[PDB]
Write an enzyme that holds these catalytic residues in place. Structure first.
Site, PDB file in Angstrom:
ATOM      1  N   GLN A  54      33.193  48.450  33.866  1.00 30.97           N
ATOM      2  CA  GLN A  54      34.315  47.501  34.158  1.00 30.97           C
ATOM      3  C   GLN A  54      34.961  47.759  35.516  1.00 30.97           C
ATOM      4  O   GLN A  54      35.488  46.837  36.099  1.00 30.97           O
ATOM      5  CB  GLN A  54      35.388  47.522  33.040  1.00 30.97           C
ATOM      6  N   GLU A  98      43.803  23.351  62.565  1.00 27.53           N
ATOM      7  CA  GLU A  98      42.987  24.584  62.596  1.00 27.53           C
ATOM      8  C   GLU A  98      43.233  25.442  61.328  1.00 27.53           C
ATOM      9  O   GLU A  98      42.296  25.879  60.666  1.00 27.53           O
ATOM     10  CB  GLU A  98      43.314  25.395  63.835  1.00 27.53           C
ATOM     11  N   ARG A 113      21.179  46.411  40.388  1.00 28.60           N
ATOM     12  CA  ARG A 113      21.301  47.828  40.641  1.00 28.60           C
ATOM     13  C   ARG A 113      21.676  48.577  39.377  1.00 28.60           C
ATOM     14  O   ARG A 113      22.651  48.239  38.711  1.00 28.60           O
ATOM     15  CB  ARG A 113      22.345  48.119  41.760  1.00 28.60           C
TER      16      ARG A 113
HETATM   17  C1  LIG Z   1      28.911  57.530  55.377  1.00 24.98           C
HETATM   18  C2  LIG Z   1      28.162  58.060  54.180  1.00 24.98           C
HETATM   19  C3  LIG Z   1      27.653  59.375  54.225  1.00 24.98           C
HETATM   20  C4  LIG Z   1      26.915  59.870  53.116  1.00 24.98           C
HETATM   21  N1  LIG Z   1      26.415  61.135  53.185  1.00 24.98           N
HETATM   22  C5  LIG Z   1      25.692  61.695  52.190  1.00 24.98           C
HETATM   23  C6  LIG Z   1      25.075  63.063  52.296  1.00 24.98           C
HETATM   24  O1  LIG Z   1      25.249  63.773  53.287  1.00 24.98           O
HETATM   25  N2  LIG Z   1      24.345  63.523  51.260  1.00 24.98           N
HETATM   26  C7  LIG Z   1      24.130  62.750  50.156  1.00 24.98           C
HETATM   27  O2  LIG Z   1      23.387  63.167  49.225  1.00 24.98           O
HETATM   28  N3  LIG Z   1      24.675  61.493  49.980  1.00 24.98           N
HETATM   29  C8  LIG Z   1      25.445  60.908  50.954  1.00 24.98           C
HETATM   30  N4  LIG Z   1      25.970  59.575  50.827  1.00 24.98           N
HETATM   31  C9  LIG Z   1      25.697  58.806  49.622  1.00 24.98           C
HETATM   32  C10 LIG Z   1      26.991  58.711  48.779  1.00 24.98           C
HETATM   33  O3  LIG Z   1      27.366  59.950  48.153  1.00 24.98           O
HETATM   34  C11 LIG Z   1      26.837  57.556  47.802  1.00 24.98           C
HETATM   35  O4  LIG Z   1      26.791  56.354  48.598  1.00 24.98           O
HETATM   36  C12 LIG Z   1      27.831  57.457  46.631  1.00 24.98           C
HETATM   37  O5  LIG Z   1      27.631  58.571  45.702  1.00 24.98           O
HETATM   38  C13 LIG Z   1      27.649  56.143  45.858  1.00 24.98           C
HETATM   39  O6  LIG Z   1      26.260  56.011  45.530  1.00 24.98           O
HETATM   40  P1  LIG Z   1      25.527  54.654  45.843  1.00 24.98           P
HETATM   41  O7  LIG Z   1      25.677  54.226  47.291  1.00 24.98           O
HETATM   42  O8  LIG Z   1      24.079  54.728  45.350  1.00 24.98           O
HETATM   43  O9  LIG Z   1      26.238  53.505  44.977  1.00 24.98           O
HETATM   44  P2  LIG Z   1      25.998  53.186  43.414  1.00 24.98           P
HETATM   45  O10 LIG Z   1      26.088  54.534  42.725  1.00 24.98           O
HETATM   46  O11 LIG Z   1      24.813  52.240  43.313  1.00 24.98           O
HETATM   47  O12 LIG Z   1      27.375  52.384  43.083  1.00 24.98           O
HETATM   48  C14 LIG Z   1      27.551  50.985  43.402  1.00 24.98           C
HETATM   49  C15 LIG Z   1      28.887  50.588  42.739  1.00 24.98           C
HETATM   50  O13 LIG Z   1      28.818  50.836  41.312  1.00 24.98           O
HETATM   51  C16 LIG Z   1      29.878  51.683  40.901  1.00 24.98           C
HETATM   52  N5  LIG Z   1      29.517  52.640  39.834  1.00 24.98           N
HETATM   53  C17 LIG Z   1      28.391  53.398  39.747  1.00 24.98           C
HETATM   54  N6  LIG Z   1      28.479  54.244  38.661  1.00 24.98           N
HETATM   55  C18 LIG Z   1      29.685  54.034  38.063  1.00 24.98           C
HETATM   56  C19 LIG Z   1      30.431  54.553  36.886  1.00 24.98           C
HETATM   57  N7  LIG Z   1      29.919  55.552  36.084  1.00 24.98           N
HETATM   58  N8  LIG Z   1      31.670  54.026  36.646  1.00 24.98           N
HETATM   59  C20 LIG Z   1      32.244  53.050  37.428  1.00 24.98           C
HETATM   60  N9  LIG Z   1      31.596  52.529  38.495  1.00 24.98           N
HETATM   61  C21 LIG Z   1      30.359  52.970  38.856  1.00 24.98           C
HETATM   62  C22 LIG Z   1      30.246  52.482  42.187  1.00 24.98           C
HETATM   63  O14 LIG Z   1      31.569  53.074  42.180  1.00 24.98           O
HETATM   64  C23 LIG Z   1      30.041  51.419  43.289  1.00 24.98           C
HETATM   65  O15 LIG Z   1      31.163  50.527  43.261  1.00 24.98           O
HETATM   66  C24 LIG Z   1      26.721  59.026  51.914  1.00 24.98           C
HETATM   67  C25 LIG Z   1      27.235  57.709  51.878  1.00 24.98           C
HETATM   68  C26 LIG Z   1      27.938  57.213  52.996  1.00 24.98           C
HETATM   69  C27 LIG Z   1      28.491  55.828  52.938  1.00 24.98           C
HETATM   70  C1  LIG Z   2      54.092  37.942  21.575  1.00 24.24           C
HETATM   71  C2  LIG Z   2      52.767  38.043  20.861  1.00 24.24           C
HETATM   72  C3  LIG Z   2      52.382  37.000  19.994  1.00 24.24           C
HETATM   73  C4  LIG Z   2      51.153  37.104  19.289  1.00 24.24           C
HETATM   74  N1  LIG Z   2      50.807  36.096  18.441  1.00 24.24           N
HETATM   75  C5  LIG Z   2      49.664  36.104  17.718  1.00 24.24           C
HETATM   76  C6  LIG Z   2      49.317  35.029  16.725  1.00 24.24           C
HETATM   77  O1  LIG Z   2      50.041  34.046  16.560  1.00 24.24           O
HETATM   78  N2  LIG Z   2      48.168  35.141  16.029  1.00 24.24           N
HETATM   79  C7  LIG Z   2      47.356  36.226  16.187  1.00 24.24           C
HETATM   80  O2  LIG Z   2      46.319  36.351  15.478  1.00 24.24           O
HETATM   81  N3  LIG Z   2      47.600  37.244  17.089  1.00 24.24           N
HETATM   82  C8  LIG Z   2      48.731  37.250  17.866  1.00 24.24           C
HETATM   83  N4  LIG Z   2      49.044  38.328  18.765  1.00 24.24           N
HETATM   84  C9  LIG Z   2      48.133  39.457  18.880  1.00 24.24           C
HETATM   85  C10 LIG Z   2      47.402  39.381  20.241  1.00 24.24           C
HETATM   86  O3  LIG Z   2      46.430  38.323  20.318  1.00 24.24           O
HETATM   87  C11 LIG Z   2      46.832  40.756  20.551  1.00 24.24           C
HETATM   88  O4  LIG Z   2      47.962  41.628  20.755  1.00 24.24           O
HETATM   89  C12 LIG Z   2      45.782  40.872  21.670  1.00 24.24           C
HETATM   90  O5  LIG Z   2      44.545  40.196  21.276  1.00 24.24           O
HETATM   91  C13 LIG Z   2      45.454  42.341  21.974  1.00 24.24           C
HETATM   92  O6  LIG Z   2      45.142  42.991  20.735  1.00 24.24           O
HETATM   93  P1  LIG Z   2      45.843  44.357  20.392  1.00 24.24           P
HETATM   94  O7  LIG Z   2      47.355  44.279  20.476  1.00 24.24           O
HETATM   95  O8  LIG Z   2      45.308  44.887  19.058  1.00 24.24           O
HETATM   96  O9  LIG Z   2      45.403  45.424  21.507  1.00 24.24           O
HETATM   97  P2  LIG Z   2      44.012  46.239  21.568  1.00 24.24           P
HETATM   98  O10 LIG Z   2      42.937  45.190  21.351  1.00 24.24           O
HETATM   99  O11 LIG Z   2      44.177  47.495  20.729  1.00 24.24           O
HETATM  100  O12 LIG Z   2      43.990  46.628  23.148  1.00 24.24           O
HETATM  101  C14 LIG Z   2      44.737  47.747  23.680  1.00 24.24           C
HETATM  102  C15 LIG Z   2      44.273  47.879  25.145  1.00 24.24           C
HETATM  103  O13 LIG Z   2      42.838  48.088  25.188  1.00 24.24           O
HETATM  104  C16 LIG Z   2      42.215  47.109  26.000  1.00 24.24           C
HETATM  105  N5  LIG Z   2      40.891  46.663  25.516  1.00 24.24           N
HETATM  106  C17 LIG Z   2      40.537  46.356  24.239  1.00 24.24           C
HETATM  107  N6  LIG Z   2      39.244  45.877  24.215  1.00 24.24           N
HETATM  108  C18 LIG Z   2      38.778  45.861  25.495  1.00 24.24           C
HETATM  109  C19 LIG Z   2      37.521  45.498  26.201  1.00 24.24           C
HETATM  110  N7  LIG Z   2      36.431  44.986  25.527  1.00 24.24           N
HETATM  111  N8  LIG Z   2      37.496  45.655  27.559  1.00 24.24           N
HETATM  112  C20 LIG Z   2      38.562  46.133  28.287  1.00 24.24           C
HETATM  113  N9  LIG Z   2      39.718  46.500  27.689  1.00 24.24           N
HETATM  114  C21 LIG Z   2      39.885  46.384  26.343  1.00 24.24           C
HETATM  115  C22 LIG Z   2      43.196  45.898  25.958  1.00 24.24           C
HETATM  116  O14 LIG Z   2      43.043  44.950  27.043  1.00 24.24           O
HETATM  117  C23 LIG Z   2      44.569  46.606  25.931  1.00 24.24           C
HETATM  118  O15 LIG Z   2      44.855  47.070  27.257  1.00 24.24           O
HETATM  119  C24 LIG Z   2      50.271  38.275  19.501  1.00 24.24           C
HETATM  120  C25 LIG Z   2      50.664  39.316  20.373  1.00 24.24           C
HETATM  121  C26 LIG Z   2      51.902  39.221  21.043  1.00 24.24           C
HETATM  122  C27 LIG Z   2      52.298  40.317  21.974  1.00 24.24           C
END
Ligand SMILES: Cc1cc2nc3c(=O)[nH]c(=O)nc-3n(C[C@H](O)[C@H](O)[C@H](O)COP(=O)(O)OP(=O)(O)OC[C@H]3O[C@@H](n4cnc5c(N)ncnc54)[C@H](O)[C@@H]3O)c2cc1C
Ligand SMILES: Cc1cc2nc3c(=O)[nH]c(=O)nc-3n(C[C@H](O)[C@H](O)[C@H](O)COP(=O)(O)OP(=O)(O)OC[C@H]3O[C@@H](n4cnc5c(N)ncnc54)[C@H](O)[C@@H]3O)c2cc1C
Ligand SMILES: Cc1cc2nc3c(=O)[nH]c(=O)nc-3n(C[C@H](O)[C@H](O)[C@H](O)COP(=O)(O)OP(=O)(O)OC[C@H]3O[C@@H](n4cnc5c(N)ncnc54)[C@H](O)[C@@H]3O)c2cc1C
Ligand SMILES: Cc1cc2nc3c(=O)[nH]c(=O)nc-3n(C[C@H](O)[C@H](O)[C@H](O)COP(=O)(O)OP(=O)(O)OC[C@H]3O[C@@H](n4cnc5c(N)ncnc54)[C@H](O)[C@@H]3O)c2cc1C
Ligand SMILES: *P(=O)(O)OCC(C)(C)[C@@H](O)C(=O)NCCC(=O)NCCSC(=O)c1ccc[nH]1
Ligand SMILES: *P(=O)(O)OCC(C)(C)[C@@H](O)C(=O)NCCC(=O)NCCSC(=O)c1ccc[nH]1
Lengths: 71, 372, 372, 372, 372, 71, 71, 71
Positions: free
Chosen positions: C271, C234, C260
């Site tokens: 992200q 299971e 969406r």
């Molecule tokens: C039980 C309940 C009661 C509610 N009551 C009310 C009410 O009385 N009045 C009212 O107006 N509304 C109400 N809502 C709506 C509520 O405020 C929304 O559901 C909320 O703001 C999220 O909007 P959404 O559902 O459209 O999701 P979306 O905004 O479509 O989001 C979907 C996903 O995308 C992510 N996302 C969106 N934008 C970003 C960003 N900038 N960065 C990172 N992630 C992002 C969200 O965090 C989520 O994970 C209610 C919802 C529930 C569940």
């Molecule tokens: C032990 C070691 C050995 C290494 N050896 C080599 C080698 O042999 N050759 C070589 O060329 N390099 C090498 N590196 C470099 C390594 O590849 C980099 O450190 C790595 O690519 C991250 O780059 P950075 O340190 O400039 O950080 P940054 O790129 O400045 O990042 C800083 C932070 O920002 C975040 N970030 C950046 N861009 C994004 C994005 N698009 N989305 C989300 N988050 C983001 C990162 O994830 C991190 O959290 C080595 C590093 C270490 C620690």
């Protein structure tokens, strides 16, 4: 203006100037407003009153600059 | 810096704990909460005759007590949505006439308010609302659908957020109190959903609804910031419910693990069980302190948004873990509805979505930390 | 070492994927699964006319396919409980006469079997069963309550584990097939429970039930080890369902996150959303490989208990995370029942309890690692 | 679908396990690994006299064995960087003359290669390389700094990735093998870093280095895709080291928890300890299967990038958890250097950065899942 | 209930923050901390001339400030071990003569104390100490090895816990202050260990050490409870260091993520990075509040053991996550020693072991929750 | 072309046409290339050989369209 | 016998002898059986057939010793 | 006494009586002491002063009972 380009828009918008419509193009929003207001407080000593956050003052850099002067 | 409650605050908390046992939509229980004073906790006497005008800390402590003793979490949630998302922006941004007209019956629960911002295409991003409001003389005409309205079916008023000027973006929205009797409102049936059954959730459509301009909250264009202020209230105070609900989960797990035996020992003797419970206690102390801190900070006139977003996130995430861990501790009995455990996970999964998802709370935290 | 499926195995998998769309207790769907061959997959033709006598890998691959395409997980679970906890111990430990008598109708699903070991005081610890079986000539008299019997209400036979000799402890239990028509059986109504609605769960009481000794599975005293062998089946094969269910969750999240939009981008561009989905894909590849490995190892006649317990644990834990993450990705729509997402978490929370809780799987893993 | 190793593959694995005991930069141990055949495992006899020309699965299995028995992980890492990031792109994209010139001494370790792509401003994003290569007749002139070169100080050749045409973006880079004796190379001293002490890490500057065009790997512009192909090799095969290292961690924790007593029982009797070890075993079985799957898939000529990125992520993340959990299990003794436990965490934290960070692996997974 | 620091407490905190920049065993820095007042914070003026006699909250706030500004965590840890595990039990349980003799030089750091309880076979379980103390007239003869003594090599006094009566079990141990010049003490060289290099760790052997009975702390048999009281001080106050260290980690990650760019955006723009930082901020607010709560509760004369154990656990666990996440955020630069990031993980991994492992903290929490 | 705008660029770049330099402006990169190649395989039945991934063919939509025709 | 005391019972049961009823007192159970069977395989080269796991052979150390001899 | 058997020892020690040496046999330890002291407070209204926690009073149930009476 350097601020909006670097901190708020980072990459590009190198066309940005004192006439770019900040609200209309979505440059100033709930998040970027917080950073802008903090910058204004730090850089100019000015804390924008709530009444003053409106589309007249935040239309563009010129109008915003005008508000900060008044204050 | 102290963690001492006044004798009065302790008394109110004990009163909330005792009230839990005295408990379609559970209208009778709603009215009982009204009589207890749940909807009037933060309303000044100036606006409602038995409004308590409590400070934020006292208010959240009582709500926590109710979240602990009242097993109908959904009902508390409906009540808090009405109070914090609706009564508070009315209190803060309504004309004096609107406040005297609306708050007395909001405060007793005789009239019920619903908050309406989310749409078919606006959820986490509310920058672009398809719902419009057009000025026509002394009136506004409102047009659009709101998709997830808590209390939608039972609402006597909707606080509705609408675009008044597309070109003003973020500062182009306005808040309105829309009475239920306004021609052009239609409401869908309550959705079937995972939890919080007592809190109705509905689609609400506004088909050319005409309302007088005195129903506007604040000025034209202030909609986004009034909404932010109402979420500051809701994210802070509404989530006190779930800190109480988690104390209940924890109490139930401790009792059960001390009573239930497998092979001649209580299950409390297995660290897989007891260390699991220890972590529920840790996460709960943490979430409760974060709530107290956010509520205190909100009373200080500093930007308290970071603390509120951290509290909302920590409480709602802890509540999901609490719901899952309670089932784990209780075994098959927790999976059965009669186990009276499995409502926590169903309700908790709502709490990481409404009032802004966990992802949005982290967006706000990152912003308040100064991350670009 | 290869990960290649034969043309035949691929064909069977595609057949399972296509079968999903062709779908009180859903008896018609149960019979449709019977006609597809679900209950006969591992039964030799020797014992049932259309029994497939598939090997373990082929059997789990087909079950995975069904778990992916059939949205009624509870139904698949009922079917797998019947096949792996009941048909397999019958196949492995029944007399030749019992096998010819019982397997043909078990294999088609015409008769349904339920597994019955858990009691009021026996769950994770089954060392001391209060249910007794007393020898009386050619018969045994069975007495006791079994507390969480999947398929309890619909069962034509119970595989019941009972104490035959208290003093022989671990080697003092015996397995019996108890026909439903045995006087003295009573069954409570199906429990209301968090998920898996199509799989009945019931209390079953055996009040001095007399059965002929030919209904015993194996020898007196072998009960504990036959039960272990049935859980090996299971824990290994039944959980293939949820690997398929997780592929479905993942497919749904990818589609939704690519469709969406919030603020003029797909939510896949955040992200917080996309890296969440990446981890669902990681945990799923992992759980699937662990299943394949456990199924392969079970075919090798080595002690495969560690691999099976790791697979059961990894699948069921991944499935809980998948259910939660699917809701998160879908937002309010995932919380609504019409979102067709929230059955994963409800069902998943069952999967970390039945067939031994996650804590018990770790006990078994620790034992097989040689931990004292 | 099977998990059976051939008698030959088993023999080679046992040979790798036995070799571990036979073991500034540890040049003598490097040469011993050379004699064992570590640097020649995937090199065809056509190009190196004792090159084994093993398939990917056999190669990773031997590497895993070495990662288990050789406690100098850093040394294995240096060796794998040389083989998979340097010898393999040479094998795959070098002219026939370059291959005969370079591979014989790479294959024995007599000459050492280093991979050089990361710069001061290029790490996770390698789309815009500041290092340039300018064509001048039959030669290229290379100019720029490479910031984290594994084997930098000991390298006889650098595989260097440079921009040949800014306007061609992604298809505007080229790979070159740069001999160490090229005038204009300078190398900084080995960095002091958290782990992997035996693998030198260095800054390398190329000041107008002139090299003949026959040192180019592939065509002008192919640099990005050759780099991707070399990371496919490295992310897949190099990480086999840490799966072996984790088997060692696990073996050490089981032995210790069965030997160490607190209050008259072995610490294995506390589930906080034993369930922790069970999860190390789970995560290890999972990471190992993911490796085997990625290696098998890489041998199938399908896009295996998703499987490789999942394996790299799962192995490196499991390895960090293994390092932390080994310390926890061993207590103060694990914190002490003489405990011979604390190198796992120090080394593991490297493994979630090099070859692309965990965040980049999830980017790749998301892309291969089809997320926009 | 408030979270407000007095003007004086704020001033002291700012003084601690500024002091950080003014900074074998770093004896000069130890003496500088002595002059700042670090070792005298909780010592009454009655016993040491510049003893501050601060309350617990003020004391922990200053320590937090030092943990934030002083990068030598190991040094702060040595200092706190001396103050909380040694000076406090002396203050609480020493005769008036012992207190006047010892505290003045302990309070300035002119003399250094070490705490000595752990043995070869006593770590998490200290119920059975092999170190014995035999009464002989007015003297005790102490015999045994203590295995992990922080400050062992530099100690002027050892607080040593020894068995005085095997048959009295838990109430059969006694605490003694053992001067370093007592014939029969030998100390091994400082261990090489993963972190906290400035805090010496040593084996200390007591070979028939004779000490006068006035060196006993409390009464014969009180050893276990005095040790518990000293751990209440240490688990509460010493861990304030790491809350400061985590504020520093967080500040460094925010700065770096706002400065470091990959592909023309700051890495703060990737949610894999920014949401990671958000969770560091969450876990830090949580751990800090838990510390403040434990310190406040310790000042209330209730059993504060649960709050202290939760705080120790939450701080030390958050600190391990902070160390790992700081490396992740900083990439290769965090892995390099010059990145000045990788001391957090090395030090943090100590903090989940000393003062009772995380598993022991959960044992204590479970006990205070009333789990059997 | 609809594809690049919707799947690869999503929001804006509504100026995109058959002449937009895809490589030069960073539109085609290691990740977007994978999605484009899959689309080409799905929509046209064409699997672009490795030799053919180069700056001549991927310069813009016109040149890419030309390669897919040839294949 | 040393084995059962050390590996299976660890602490105490220092009264254990060749007559202690292993099944009846719960000493041999599903988990301890696995460890015992592995020990028997390692220490004596004997793999106890399934038929032979029963209350007659596992009654006590004496009877178990008798089974291992037979095998 | 019922308490020590059920809450502290749970399974077995059914030989426990007013003479069982609680300290010597490890029955009373840092953890069980907390539970015992809470029980004593709940069941008898007595909060044992710190001075009184010693081997004389906690030797066995009889001596402990004697202390609770005195208090
Ligand atoms: C039980 C309940 C009661 C509610 N009551 C009310 C009410 O009385 N009045 C009212 O107006 N509304 C109400 N809502 C709506 C509520 O405020 C929304 O559901 C909320 O703001 C999220 O909007 P959404 O559902 O459209 O999701 P979306 O905004 O479509 O989001 C979907 C996903 O995308 C992510 N996302 C969106 N934008 C970003 C960003 N900038 N960065 C990172 N992630 C992002 C969200 O965090 C989520 O994970 C209610 C919802 C529930 C569940
Ligand atoms: C032990 C070691 C050995 C290494 N050896 C080599 C080698 O042999 N050759 C070589 O060329 N390099 C090498 N590196 C470099 C390594 O590849 C980099 O450190 C790595 O690519 C991250 O780059 P950075 O340190 O400039 O950080 P940054 O790129 O400045 O990042 C800083 C932070 O920002 C975040 N970030 C950046 N861009 C994004 C994005 N698009 N989305 C989300 N988050 C983001 C990162 O994830 C991190 O959290 C080595 C590093 C270490 C620690
Ligand atoms: C949907 C569903 C279907 C089921 N179907 C069947 C069926 O068909 N036939 C049948 O006989 N039974 C069935 N069961 C019962 C199921 O097998 C048990 O629920 C399971 O074995 C746990 O037993 P329990 O509920 O009594 O919990 P308990 O055993 O009371 O456990 C409660 C908690 O204590 C922990 N615990 C207990 N012992 C230990 C230990 N040694 N180490 C660490 N932790 C421990 C558990 O892990 C759990 O967290 C079903 C249960 C469910 C939810
Ligand atoms: C940097 C550092 C400084 C130190 N300084 C001092 C000092 O100044 N004075 C001093 O006396 N000691 C000191 N110690 C020793 C320290 O207090 C112990 O290391 C700690 O109590 C754990 O003991 P142990 O190392 O023997 O591990 P063990 O007790 O052998 O534990 C090993 C593992 O078993 C687990 N375990 C043990 N018992 C239980 C249980 N009941 N439940 C669940 N799990 C359990 C542990 O949690 C751990 O995972 C120091 C240690 C370190 C690392
Ligand atoms: P800024 O004004 O501070 O805006 C912040 C950001 C940009 C994050 C904004 O997009 C935002 O706050 N998004 C989240 C939206 C939100 O919180 N929606 C909640 C709707 S009301 C709710 O769900 C509810 C339940 C009961 C009563 N109301
Ligand atoms: P050993 O014979 O290998 O026994 C192992 C241990 C000692 C861990 C034993 O206590 C055990 O296996 N406990 C877990 C019990 C268990 O798995 N119970 C499952 C009952 S059947 C089940 O839940 C189900 C659902 C559908 C069909 N059956």
């Amino acid at each position: 203006i350097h601020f909006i380009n670097n901190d708020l828009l980072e990459g590009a918008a190198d066309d940005l100037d004192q006439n770019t419509p900040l609200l209309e193009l979505g440059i100033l929003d709930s998040l970027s407003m917080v950073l802008l207001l903090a910058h204004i407080d730090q850089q100019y000593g000015v804390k924008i009153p709530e009444h003053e956050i409106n589309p007249e003052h935040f239309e563009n850099v010129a109008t915003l600059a005008a508000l900060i002067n008044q204050l | 810096m102290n963690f001492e409650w006044t004798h009065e605050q302790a008394e109110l908390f004990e009163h909330a704990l005792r009230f839990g046992k005295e408990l379609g939509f559970p209208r009778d229980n709603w009215n009982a909460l009204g009589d207890f004073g749940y909807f009037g906790l933060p309303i000044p006497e100036k606006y409602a005759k038995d409004g308590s005008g409590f400070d934020i800390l006292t208010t959240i402590k009582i709500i926590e007590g109710l979240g602990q003793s009242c097993t109908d979490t959904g009902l508390l949630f409906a009540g808090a949505a009405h109070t914090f998302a609706c009564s508070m922006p009315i209190l803060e941004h309504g004309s004096e006439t609107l406040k005297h007209q609306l708050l007395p019956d909001l405060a007793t629960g005789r009239k019920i308010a619903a908050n309406a911002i989310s749409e078919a295409s606006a959820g986490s991003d509310i920058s672009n609302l398809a719902t419009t409001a057009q000025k026509e003389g002394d009136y506004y005409v409102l047009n659009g659908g709101k998709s997830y309205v808590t209390n939608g079916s039972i609402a006597d008023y909707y606080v509705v957020y609408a675009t008044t000027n597309k070109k003003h973006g973020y500062l182009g929205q306005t808040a309105f109190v829309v009475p239920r009797n306004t021609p052009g409102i239609s409401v869908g049936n309550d959705y079937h959903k995972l939890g919080l059954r007592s809190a109705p959730l509905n689609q609400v459509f506004f088909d050319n609804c005409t309302i007088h301009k005195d129903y506007a909250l604040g000025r034209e264009g202030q909609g986004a910031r009034i909404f932010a202020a109402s979420m500051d209230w809701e994210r802070c105070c509404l989530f006190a419910i779930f800190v109480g609900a988690m104390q209940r989960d924890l109490n139930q797990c401790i009792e059960y693990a001390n009573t239930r035996m497998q092979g001649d020992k209580t299950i409390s003797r297995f660290q897989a069980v007891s260390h699991r419970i220890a972590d529920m206690g840790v996460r709960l102390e943490s979430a409760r302190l974060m709530l107290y801190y956010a509520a205190w900070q909100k009373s200080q006139d500093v930007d308290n948004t970071k603390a509120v977003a951290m509290s909302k996130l920590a409480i709602s995430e802890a509540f999901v873990q609490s719901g899952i861990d309670s089932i784990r501790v209780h075994g098959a009995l927790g999976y059965l509805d009669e186990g009276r455990v499995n409502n926590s996970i169903k309700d908790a999964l709502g709490s990481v979505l409404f009032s802004g998802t966990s992802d949005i709370q982290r967006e706000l935290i990152c912003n308040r930390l100064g991350l670009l």
